[PDB]
């Protein structure tokens, strides 16, 4: 009946002064816009149908046309920025926010979805949705004693749209909006649905992707132990944003980093640093590099958790971008650690895989590695053991690399090499 109408027929029905004819044509537009292969969003926009869809959002006495136009506008808003802007330009934001309080759950849910697409376009539309007042009625939909009484799909859509209000960074969402959203986010982070959990972690990862004061707003809410638990989940869609949130937090202060350690996060890293998904391994190793950039007592916790052998492992074999994070983790370690912690690094076998990576063409990973060797040599000078390290570097073919890096396009790489040759290989 409403399957595969031409746009011309849709316009004809929507432009009739017959509400039932408009309903039929609107549903036909919805089905057109619902197909997978190239829905004709632009043809629908060019026919001038968005203002009519938006006015149908307000037809309280015909809830079916509210639903059909909400769905049609949702799918237009799901397209390019220009296509989303056309929905916004038609006045859809206040009309969708008014539908959040609809007694029809399926209409309210569709308005949640539509605002998620609009907010998800970028910071400006996100903040415009916030200025029109979306947050209060969105949160009111989740003000229930037990989240489990809400329909699963409804709860997932609410969580996803909330995460888009937490997303994007130039600028970050308004501080007061984040403060307003966070207690509901914390409650969603303890829900048992894996999709709600994944999108809740994503939202937290966005909020911690910023300056230390942004991290602190999240960390003060006590979520770190729950993030560490989710870090151990078997669902990769949960581990990935949980790890990104944890990695964001350890870019903050040493005190914020300590809350991650206190929560037991380091005990998960044997798995994460050998995880078969290469980007988990990379994110986990980046996280390690920001922990080894901390206090000596935090470096010591890395040691105690047996994580240095795992760093030797990723340095020895891993995709190259993970090995770069591992090199950073080692140089950070050698820059802040004690003599004993640096000596322990050599005893674990850091020298040979570190020398092997000097063959890379990445100029900055060589600067990073050269810095680490200089730091390890400085620890060796305090124990009179500079030679024993020189023989070890030369026995694994390292000396050949540093003496060959005496011919590099980068000036600082050349000079760091010859200084190591000058001072420890005479």
């Amino acid at each position: 009946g409403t399957v595969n109408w031409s746009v011309e027929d849709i316009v004809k029905g929507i432009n009739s002064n017959n509400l039932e004819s408009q309903l039929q044509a609107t549903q036909a537009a919805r089905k057109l816009l619902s197909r997978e292969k190239q829905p004709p969003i632009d043809n629908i926009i060019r026919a001038g149908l968005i203002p009519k869809f938006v006015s149908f959002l307000g037809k309280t006495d015909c809830s079916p046309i509210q639903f059909e136009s909400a769905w049609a506008l949702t799918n237009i808003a799901s397209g390019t920025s220009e296509q989303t802007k056309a929905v916004v330009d038609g006045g859809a934001i206040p009309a969708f926010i008014s539908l959040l309080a609809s007694p029809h759950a399926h209409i309210s849910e569709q308005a949640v979805w539509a605002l998620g697409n609009i907010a998800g376009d970028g910071s400006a539309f996100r903040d415009l949705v916030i200025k029109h007042g979306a947050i209060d009625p969105l949160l009111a939909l989740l003000a229930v004693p037990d989240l489990s009484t809400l329909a699963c799909g409804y709860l997932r859509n609410l969580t996803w749209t909330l995460s888009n209000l937490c997303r994007n960074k130039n600028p970050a969402p308004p501080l007061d909006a984040v403060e307003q959203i966070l207690p509901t986010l914390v409650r969603l982070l303890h829900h048992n649905d894996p999709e709600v959990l994944a999108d809740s972690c994503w939202a937290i990862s966005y909020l911690t992707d910023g300056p230390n004061e942004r991290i602190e707003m999240v960390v003060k809410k006590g979520v770190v132990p729950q993030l560490v638990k989710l870090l151990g989940a078997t669902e990769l869609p949960i581990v990935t944003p949980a790890l990104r949130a944890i990695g964001n937090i350890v870019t903050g202060t040493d005190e914020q980093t300590q809350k991650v350690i206190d929560a037991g996060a380091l005990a998960v890293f044997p798995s994460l640093l050998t995880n078969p998904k290469t980007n988990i391994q990379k994110e986990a190793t980046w996280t390690m590099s920001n922990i080894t950039a901390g206090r000596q007592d935090q470096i010591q916790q890395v040691v105690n958790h047996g994580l240095v052998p795992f760093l030797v492992g990723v340095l020895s074999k891993a995709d190259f971008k993970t090995q770069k994070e591992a090199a950073w983790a080692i140089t950070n370690y050698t820059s802040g650690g004690t003599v004993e912690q640096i000596v322990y690094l050599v005893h674990c076998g850091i020298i040979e895989p570190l020398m092997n990576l000097l063959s890379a063409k990445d100029t900055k990973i060589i600067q990073v590695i050269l810095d680490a060797i200089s730091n390890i040599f400085q620890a060796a000078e305090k124990l009179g053991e500079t030679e024993k390290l020189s023989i070890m570097i030369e026995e694994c073919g390292g000396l050949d690399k540093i003496e060959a890096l005496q011919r590099h396009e980068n000036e600082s790489v050349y000079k760091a090499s010859l200084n190591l040759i000058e001072k420890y290989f005479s």
């Binding site: 619902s34 829905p39 799918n75 799901s78 979805w113 990862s205 944003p241």
Partner: peptide
Amino acid sequence: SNPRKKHRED
């Protein structure tokens, strides 16, 4: 992140 926007096909 996961998708910025979501299309509803049903």
